[PDB]
Amino acid sequence: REHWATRLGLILAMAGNAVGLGNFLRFPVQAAENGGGAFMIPYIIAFLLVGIPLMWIEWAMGRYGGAQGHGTTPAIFYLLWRNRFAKILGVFGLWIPLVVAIYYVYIESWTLGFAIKFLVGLVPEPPPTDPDSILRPFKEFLYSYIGVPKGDEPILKPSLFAYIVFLITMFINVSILIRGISKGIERFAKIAMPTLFILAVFLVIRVFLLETPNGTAADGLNFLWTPDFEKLKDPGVWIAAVGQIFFTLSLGFGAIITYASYVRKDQDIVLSGLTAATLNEKAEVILGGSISIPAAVAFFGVANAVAIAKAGAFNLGFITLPAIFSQTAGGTFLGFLWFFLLFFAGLTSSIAIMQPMIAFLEDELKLSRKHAVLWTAAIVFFSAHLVMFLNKSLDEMDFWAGTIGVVFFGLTELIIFFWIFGADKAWEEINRGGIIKVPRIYYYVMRYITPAFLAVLLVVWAREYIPKIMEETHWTVWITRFYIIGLFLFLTFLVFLAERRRNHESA
Ligand SMILES: CCCCCCCCO[C@@H]1O[C@H](CO)[C@@H](O)[C@H](O)[C@H]1O
Ligand SMILES: CCCCCCCCO[C@@H]1O[C@H](CO)[C@@H](O)[C@H](O)[C@H]1O
Ligand SMILES: CCCCCCCCO[C@@H]1O[C@H](CO)[C@@H](O)[C@H](O)[C@H]1O
Ligand SMILES: CCCCCCCCO[C@@H]1O[C@H](CO)[C@@H](O)[C@H](O)[C@H]1O
Ligand SMILES: CCCCCCCCO[C@@H]1O[C@H](CO)[C@@H](O)[C@H](O)[C@H]1O
Ligand SMILES: CC(C)C[C@H](N)C(=O)O
Ligand SMILES: [Cl-]
Ligand SMILES: [Cl-]
Ligand code: NA
Ligand code: NA
Incomplete structure (x- = not known):
């Protein structure tokens, strides 16, 4: 099997796994929609009860499976619980990454396209005071990029440049992926992670220099970091906090497990996982949290910045921030650094959620790496056309795989590992x-506190929120549901094909 060459390379590839678009796009939106500091308390708690233990559990599962030549959960779940239903539960560990990758790479490609257009100065020209006259040209720039529907049909019409990008x-x-783990993912993380930290710090610095009649960047920092204990009783904030923690640390996506299956059997995972998890949180709460919200609060005030964040998941990052930057000297180049930052943010994470499908093809179907990467890309490139052309296909994928699915699978992998396999x-x-060593208190968190925390959460979804998504959406959502369900069917057939190759090989 292939291995991480260096300790540092493993941590940067794991940090590059976790530090991604969630740090800089999702966290600001999720924090502002939920009252700023009111979000932080459930966020810090969820990090301590959910994020940290699951990080360790997935590192263990990966490394455990990797010592037996398996990097994906269809095989690893069976190594932990010898039962067909572990193989079937394991398909989610391939399905969730592959579904998430179908829409993540596309959003990643926007930042590359926006970066190119901002670098070359092919950006809108706001008329030099009214905010709408400054924002609308950038709303129209993004809408023309991905092709937001202008009529009644739910059809997207992306620009030729977008599709080529x-x-x-x-x-x-x-x-990157075709070069492997050590000569591909590892080498690129040693380059991308410094680049990414540098860019973010510079942007944080430049945003902290913003002052207008409506506020300063410190006003956004106070909003993000001022507690509001009157929201701790809201199931929505806790749902939003735990869903963010999952998304940011790459938990429940089968990616940490696959990366960890390339760690040598003797090598540490306790300090390693903790460092990478500690790295991803600094990346969000310090860097990601100090760019979008302070800048938006700085030009518009808190209430409008909150209103901007509630408008959509991309308004703040793809429209508001460049519009803000366009009002400052060299702001076009500042936009380029912002979108170049996002591109390495997503690229180090997109290679992470595509390695599982590769690993499954190499480990369980014995495909060469070249063929495993290329077939994996073909699967993603084709499937992404559903996200590119059907309005709100992206949303449905992010909900079932990137939101519900990661919390379900995270509870699934904890019970399989830490109850069925045996807590001790x-x-x-x-x-x-x-x-x-993992602190002794965390054994009781893993066995009892974490699984009940998630169980209660998933029950609040299943009763108070998902009924609106099964009955109050446009009929086209079943187009995506049908496709991602058939995608699961296809992966199980591969699993079935992998256990039949293993019966003929032993014979
Ligand atoms: C069922 C279709 C399977 C894959 C076919 C993809 C067709 C891609 O079509 C392309 O889309 C671009 C963006 O809209 C356009 O700029 C091009 O005119 C068009 O050739
Ligand atoms: C990074 C290199 C990407 C090259 C993408 C080329 C897409 C060309 O596309 C064309 O470019 C013209 C000039 O801007 C536009 O007027 C047209 O709308 C567009 O069809
Ligand atoms: C679900 C994935 C398939 C959707 C992509 C199909 C691309 C359709 O292609 C479209 O065909 C039209 C007429 O032929 C042209 O007007 C457009 O230029 C082109 O975008
Ligand atoms: C999953 C649904 C997304 C598919 C994108 C629809 C592209 C709309 O393109 C349509 O293609 C039709 C057949 O070629 C033509 O009759 C129309 O000229 C054209 O409007
Ligand atoms: C619910 C999650 C709590 C995380 C905080 C744990 C802080 C670690 O706590 C320490 O753990 C050590 C090893 O067990 C002990 O030696 C110490 O008594 C204890 O202070
Ligand atoms: C799906 C994951 C790779 C997402 C990544 N951890 C991020 O925060 O952007
Ligand atoms: Cl364009
Ligand atoms: Cl219709
Ligand atoms: Na993250
Ligand atoms: Na990343």
């Missing part, structure tokens, strides 16, 4: 090779 973006992701055998397998 998507092909370019895929080609960029293939070029799991505790042993987490701490083995540990440069440090």
Whole structure:
């Protein structure tokens, strides 16, 4: 099997796994929609009860499976629970990454397209005071990029440049992955992670220099970091906080497990996982949290910045921030650094959610790496056409795989690992090779607190929110549901094909 060459390269590839578009696009939206500081308290708690333990559990599962030549959950779940239903539950560990990748790479390709257009100065020209006259040209710029529907039909019509930049973006992701783990994902993380930290800090600095009649960047920092204990009783904030923690640390996407299956059997995972998790949080709450919201609060005030964040998941990042930057000297180049930052943010994360499908093809179907990467890309490139052309197809995928699915699968992999396999055998397998040991209190969090926390959460979804999504959406949502359900069917057939190759090989 292939291995991470260096300790540092493993951490940067794991941090590059986690530090992505969620740090800089999703976290600002999720924080502002939910009252700023009121969001932080459930966010910090969820990090301590959910994010940290699941990080360790997935590192253990990956490394455990990797010592037996398996990197994906269809095989690893069976290694933990010898039962066909573990193989079937394991398909989610391929389905969730592949579904999420279908829409993540596309959004990643926007930032590459926006970066190119901002670098070359092919950007809108706001008329030099009215905010709408400054924002509308950038709303119209993004809407023309992805092709937001102008009539009644739910059809997207992306620009030719967007589609070509998507092909370019895929080609960029293939070029890294086809070189492997050590000569591909690892080498690129040693380059991208410094680049990304540098850019973010500079932007944080430049945003902190913003002052207008409506406020300063400190006003956004106070809004984000001022508690509001009157919201701790809202199931929505807790749902939003735990869903963010999952998304940001790459938990429930089968990606950490696959990356961890390339860690040598003896090597530490306790300090490693903690560092990468600690890295991703600094990336959000310090860097991601200090760019979008302070800048939006700085030009518009808190209430309008909150209103901007509630308008959509991309308004703040693809419309508001460049519009804000367009009012400052060299703001076009500042936009380029912003969208170039997002491109390495997503690229280090898109290669992470595409490695599982590759690993499954190499490990379980014995495909060469070249063929495993290329077939994986072909699967993503084709499938992405559903996200590109059907309005709100992206949303449905992010909900079922990137929102519901990761919390379901996260609870699934904890029970399989830490209950069925055995809590004590799991505790042993987490701490083995540990440069440090997992604190004794976390054994009781993993066995009892975390699974009940998620169980209650998933029950609040299933009763109070999902009924609106099964009955109050446009009929076209079943087009995406049908496709992603058939995608699951296809992956199980591969699993079935992988256990039949294993019966003929042993014979
Ligand atoms: C069922 C279709 C399977 C894949 C066919 C993809 C067709 C891509 O079509 C292309 O889309 C671009 C963006 O709108 C346009 O700029 C081009 O005119 C068009 O050739
Ligand atoms: C990174 C290189 C990407 C090259 C994409 C070329 C897409 C060409 O596309 C064309 O470009 C013209 C000039 O801007 C536009 O007027 C047209 O709308 C567009 O069809
Ligand atoms: C669900 C994935 C398939 C959707 C992409 C299909 C691309 C359709 O292609 C479209 O054909 C039209 C007439 O032929 C042209 O007006 C457009 O230029 C072109 O975008
Ligand atoms: C999943 C649905 C997304 C598909 C994108 C629809 C592209 C709309 O393109 C349509 O293609 C039709 C057949 O070629 C033509 O009759 C029309 O000229 C054209 O409007
Ligand atoms: C619910 C999650 C709590 C996370 C905070 C744990 C802080 C670690 O706590 C420490 O753990 C050590 C090893 O068990 C002990 O030696 C110390 O008594 C204890 O202070
Ligand atoms: C699906 C994951 C790779 C997402 C990534 N952890 C992010 O925060 O952007
Ligand atoms: Cl364009
Ligand atoms: Cl219709
Ligand atoms: Na993240
Ligand atoms: Na990343």
